[PDB]
Design a protein around this ligand. Sequence first.
Ligand SMILES: [Mg+2]
Ligand SMILES: [Mg+2]
Ligand SMILES: [Mg+2]
Ligand SMILES: [Mg+2]
Ligand SMILES: [Mg+2]
Ligand SMILES: [Mg+2]
Ligand SMILES: [Mg+2]
Ligand SMILES: [Mg+2]
Ligand SMILES: [Mg+2]
Ligand SMILES: [Mg+2]
Ligand SMILES: [Mg+2]
Lengths: 143, 78, 514, 88, 183
Amino acid sequence: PKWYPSEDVAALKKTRKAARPQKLRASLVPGTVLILLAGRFRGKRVVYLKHLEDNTLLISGPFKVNGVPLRRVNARYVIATSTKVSVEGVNVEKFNVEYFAVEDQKVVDKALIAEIKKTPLLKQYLSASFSLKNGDKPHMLKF
Amino acid sequence: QPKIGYGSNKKTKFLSPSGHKTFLVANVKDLETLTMHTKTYAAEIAHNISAKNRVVILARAKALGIKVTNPKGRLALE
Amino acid sequence: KIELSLKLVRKWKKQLHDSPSLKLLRNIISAFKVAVNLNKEDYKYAITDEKAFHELMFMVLKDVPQAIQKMAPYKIVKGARTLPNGGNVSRVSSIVKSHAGSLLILLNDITNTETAALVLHSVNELMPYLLSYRRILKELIKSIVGVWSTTRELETQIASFAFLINTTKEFKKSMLETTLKTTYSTFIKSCRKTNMRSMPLINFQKNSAAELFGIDEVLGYQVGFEYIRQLAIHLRNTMNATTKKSSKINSAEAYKIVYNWQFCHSLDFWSRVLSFACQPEKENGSESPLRQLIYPLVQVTLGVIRLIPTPQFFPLRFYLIKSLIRLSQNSGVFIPIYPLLSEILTSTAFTKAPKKSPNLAAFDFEHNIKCTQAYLNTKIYQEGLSEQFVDLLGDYFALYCKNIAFPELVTPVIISLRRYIKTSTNVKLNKRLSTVVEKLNQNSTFIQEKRSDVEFGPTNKSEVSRFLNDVAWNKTPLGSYVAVQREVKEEKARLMRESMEEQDKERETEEAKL
Amino acid sequence: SHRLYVKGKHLSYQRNPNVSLIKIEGVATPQDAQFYLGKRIAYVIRVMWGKVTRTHGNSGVVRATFRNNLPAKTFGASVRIFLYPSNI
Amino acid sequence: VEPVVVIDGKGHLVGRLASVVAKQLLNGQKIVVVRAEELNISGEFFRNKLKYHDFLFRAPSRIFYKALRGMVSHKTARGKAALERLKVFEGIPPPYDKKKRVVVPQALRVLRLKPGRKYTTLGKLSTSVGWKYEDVVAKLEAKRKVSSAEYYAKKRAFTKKVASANATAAESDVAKQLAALGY
RNA sequence: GUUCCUGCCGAAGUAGAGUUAAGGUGCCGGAAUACACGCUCAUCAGAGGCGCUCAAGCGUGUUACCUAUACUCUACCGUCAGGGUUGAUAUGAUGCCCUGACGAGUAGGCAGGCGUGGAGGUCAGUGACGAAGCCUAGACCGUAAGGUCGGGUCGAACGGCCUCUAGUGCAGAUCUUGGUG
RNA sequence: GGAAUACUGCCAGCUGGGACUGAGGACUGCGACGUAAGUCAAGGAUGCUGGCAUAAUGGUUAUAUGCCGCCCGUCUUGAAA
RNA sequence: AAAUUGUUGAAAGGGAAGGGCAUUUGAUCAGACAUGGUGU
Ligand SMILES: [Mg+2]
Ligand SMILES: [Mg+2]
Ligand SMILES: [Mg+2]
Ligand SMILES: [Mg+2]
Ligand SMILES: [Mg+2]
Ligand SMILES: [Mg+2]
Ligand SMILES: [Mg+2]
Ligand SMILES: [Mg+2]
Ligand SMILES: [Mg+2]
Ligand SMILES: [Mg+2]
Ligand SMILES: [Mg+2]
C-alpha cells in the first residue's frame, strides 16, 4: 500500500472456463505407428507409446532402428497409420512431463524391438522416411 | 462515400496511435491542467508560440511527465 | 513492496563502501530504475522521501560505478580500458546492463551543465561494460550527441563533446563509426534553426565535429565521402527535377529542397573538416586522405552556387564563397571564385538603381540565407550586398597578396572591373569597386618590384614558395587594407553580440517584476 | 526428396483481397477438396503463411486466408500446402 | 504437369484454343503454339476475311496472338506477364520439332464443328490479307512429315523392343510375387 | 440551372460469417466447355468486348456452383423509444449507465455539424527567440464539410472561447473588351 | 403367408471435420450436478507450449531495360478504348 | 503587377516533351522488450 492507486485497476471478470483432459482422435492408440510432418524428424516413421497429461504424445524411434530418440510430439502435427505393434511389453510409467524439463531409452527400446521382430519387414519400415511422390493425392491415400 | 455507418467506436474515437488524446496548450498554466491525465491526454503546443516559450513549456512538461505530441518543432525541423 | 526509507538508503550506502555483493547492486539498480521511471510508466520499491531519493541518486551516480570497478577492476591495454575474462565480470556486466538505460533516461532529460557532467562521468566509468552492447552504446552516443546537439548552454555542449573525445580516443573501434554518423546526421535533420543566438553554438558544433573526423585519417574518409555523396544525390535530384518537364514534385520551386540552411550547414562543415585535416602542420610533409575529398567538395559547392543566380539567394552564395576561401587558405588549393562573383555583377541589384528606400534594418548577411522579399530592390539591400561583395573580393585576392603570380592573377580582373566600373550607373558601387581596383594595381606594382630581384624561374617550386617568407601578409597593400577592413567588420559583429546579449539581460529584468 | 506437401497454384481473389482462390493438383471434386480444409498454406526468400478455409465451386478450387493478403502479382504463382494440422 | 506444354495448332478453333491457352497462362503454365497457319475458324472465308480487315499483322501467329490477347487484360502487369509466357509459331521451328505435341479436345474442329458447315483455314486468310510466307512453310512441313514418318518407323521398332522387354520381365519371379501379395 | 457536410421524418448505415432472389457458370470474371430432352444452322442464322455454330443460338427439365443496398447472427456507428441512477455519482442528472426497435426511401418537410465576416464579454491569450495572410502530394484527428500540428512562404500585429447579428461552392448563354492569327 | 426395403416424419440420439466471432471486466440471476463440501459446459475466453529483435521487416529515392499508351472536349462500359 | 514576347546559361530528349506498367540493378533512412525479481 506504499503507493495509492493512480487511476484505477479494472479487475477482470471471473472466467467460467475450466481446463479438461483432451479427447484424442480415435486412430491414435498405444502401439500405433506414426508419421511426423514437421520438426527435425519430419517424414520419419516412429512408434507411439503413451499420451502425457500436457497433451504431448510420447514417441520412440526406436533410436536403435532409425535414430529417433524418446521425444514429445504434438498430436495435430502427426499422421496415424493403420499398422500396430503391441505395447504391452514396454511398461512406460516412470518418465513423465516433468522428467523432460540414454539408459531409459535402452530399456524401452529392448522391449519395443522384442515386439517389432515378430511382424515381417517392420524394422525396415520404421527405418525409412516417408514423402509424397508425384501423382500421390493424400485424400484417396489410406494411411 | 462518407456516411454515419463509417463512424468510429466511442472508446477509440479521438485517439492517436500513441493512445493519447491531443490537447492544445498555449502556456504553462494551460499545461498544468493536464498534470495527472498523462495516460489519457498528451499536450500539443500551439502554432503561434514563440521559440523562447516552447523550451519552457517542454521543460515543465517533462517535469510533469506529460507527453508532448510536437516537440522539436521550431526548435528542429520535421 | 519495500518502501524507500532514509534508513534503507543509508544502509545500502553503508555496506556499499565495505564488502558489497551482487544482490545489493541489483537492489540499488532496481530502486534507481523506479526512481527514474516514476513519471514514465510491478516495481519492488516505492519512493516517498525526497531525502531518500536524492541520496539514492547521489550514491548511485557517484559510487555504484566505484563499487562496480572494485568488484571487476578493468586493466588498461594499449591505452584502452578493457575488462578481464571471468565469471564475476559477466555477472557485473549484466548489472551495468541493468543500469545503462537509467543513465540513458537521465541523459535524455539533461537540463543543466552540472547534471550533464555528473551523468556523463558516471557513464564514463561504465563504458567497459557497455561496449559489449549495441542497443546501449549506440543510444548512448546517440543521446549525448542529442545533448551535444540540443543544449543551449555552451558549457553543456563543451562537456558533451569532451566526453565524446575522451571516450572515443580510448577505444576507436565500436564507437567511432557511430559518433561521426550521429554528429553529421545532426547536421542533416536535427539541425538548430539559425539565428544570431545560435550562431556561436552551431559554430562550436561544427568546429568540434571537425576534430572528430580528423582523428582517424582513413575511417573519416570512409564516412564523409559517403555522406557528402548523399548531398550530391539531392543536388542531382533538384537539378534534374527543375530542368525536366515532369510534374512529379515541385518542378518550379525545387530550390526549397536544396537551398536550406541545413544543406549550407553541411557544405560549411565539410569545408571546415577538410581544412582542419589539410592544415600544413597536420600535413607535416605527409599526404592525408581527406585532401582527395577536396575536389568532390569543391564540385558540389560550385554546383550549388550556380544553380540559381537570383538576388533572393545572393547571401547563400556569399557563405559558401567564404567556406571555399577558407578551404583554399588552409589547403592551398586554387579555387576559381572570381568568375562567379563577376557573373553576379550583371544582376539587377548590382547594376540597376534602387527602386524603394523604406529605411528598414540592415540585412544580417553573416547569419541569414535569404532576402525575405522585402529587402529586394532597396537601397539598404544593394548597399549591404555590395558591402559584402567588395570584402569578399578583398579576401580572395588577399590570399595571394604576397605570391609572385599575383600580377597575372590581377590583370584579367582589373580589366573586367574597369569595364564594369565604366559602364555601371550606381555611384556608390563604382566608388567601392574603384578602391579595390587601385589597391589591386598597387599590390601588383609591389610584387613586381619585389620580383624584379628574383633569379629563379617559375619551375623552381621550392624557391617560389620561399618568396617573401620574411614579409608578413598584412604588410602588403591589399593586406594592410583588408586586414583593417576585417577589423571594421569584426568589431561590428562584436557590437551586435554585445548588444543582443544586453537585450536579453533587459528582457530578464521584466520577468523579475512580472 | 524431402517434400511433405503439395505445391499448389494461387488463382485469383474472391470477386475481395482478403480471400484467395487456390487450385490444388489432383483435386477434381469438392469432396476431394474437403480433405485439405484447415491445412497450412505457405507462399515462398520470404514466406507468407495462411490456411485453407472452404471449398470453391465444383472444380475443386478452395478458398484461403493469409495473415497478410497476397500482393495480387502472384496469380499463377507456386504455393505450398502442408499436411499438418493432420486430421488422420 | 509439365514445365512446358507444346500444343499443335491443327484442327483447332482460334477462339477456343486461345481461351484455353490464356486461362493456362494466367495460372502460370508456360505454353507454346506451333503450326498455327493451319488453324481453323468457324463461318465462311469472306466473313473472317472482312473481320480481320476491319481490324486492319498479317501472319497467322499474330492473328492468334491478337485473339488470345483479347482474353488477357494485357494492360495490367499480370496480363503482360501472361503474354511473355506465351509463344506462337507458324510451322514447327527447332527445338520443338523433336518433342511430341498434345491436343486440346475442347477446341478440336472435328469434335466441335458439325459436318456440312462452312469453316475457314487461317493460312488462306493470312495469305489473302497479305502474308507472303505460306509457300515456304509448306515445304518445311513436308520435310517435317518425312522426318515424322521416319520417327514413326523408329517408334514402331521401339515398341517391338518394349514388348520384348515386357515379356522378359514377365518370366522374372519378384514382380509376380509382389503382384500377388499386393500391388 | 445547381446550391458546404452529415443526419432525420416521410405521401404518391459500416465490418465478419452463413443463406438467398434476380441473374449467371468459354476468357476478361467468381461459378459445370454439367446432365437430359425436342429443335435451328436462313443469302435477312442466330447473342459489353474478345469471341461461339453437335453453340458460348433457342424452348423445355435436372441438379451442382458463383453472389448482392435482399434475409439470419455477431460487433460497430447513428435516429427513435422504454428505462436505472441523490440523506449524492469516482466526469457537465442537458451527466453516466441498461435494454430494445429501425437505417431503401421519390414528392415534400425537419434537425445537427463545418466554414465566412460584424458586435459585446472573456482567455491577467498569442508576438522579432517572428504576429496576421497564403501554400504545403508532410504527420494526427473527424464518416464528412473540415480541424490541429510540422514545414515553407510571410515580416507586424492577431487569434481561441460564450452570446446575438450577418453569411458557405459551382454551371451555362447573349455576347463585350483587349490581344493574337 | 411371412416379412424386408424405399419414401415421409420424429428424436430434449451419438460421434467427426471445417470456417468467422472472443464482444463483456469485483460479486449479484436462472441453473446444473454434487451424501456433503464444493465444482461446472450455468448472465460474452480462458489454460498449456514455444520464440520474442540490431531483427521481422517498413519507407524514400535513382538509373538501365523492355511492354502499353500517347492532341483536346464529350461519351462509354466497370475501365483505357 | 499579372498575361505575353526575345537573347543568354544549365539539363533531358528525340524527332518530339511526354506519361503509365514490368523487370533490373543500386543508394539511403526507421526498426523496443532500456522485461519486473531471485539465484552462484
Ligand atoms: Mg502553421
Ligand atoms: Mg451485411
Ligand atoms: Mg458473403
Ligand atoms: Mg460508471
Ligand atoms: Mg420506428
Ligand atoms: Mg423512412
Ligand atoms: Mg471578438
Ligand atoms: Mg489551409
Ligand atoms: Mg481516418
Ligand atoms: Mg459440428
Ligand atoms: Mg548539351
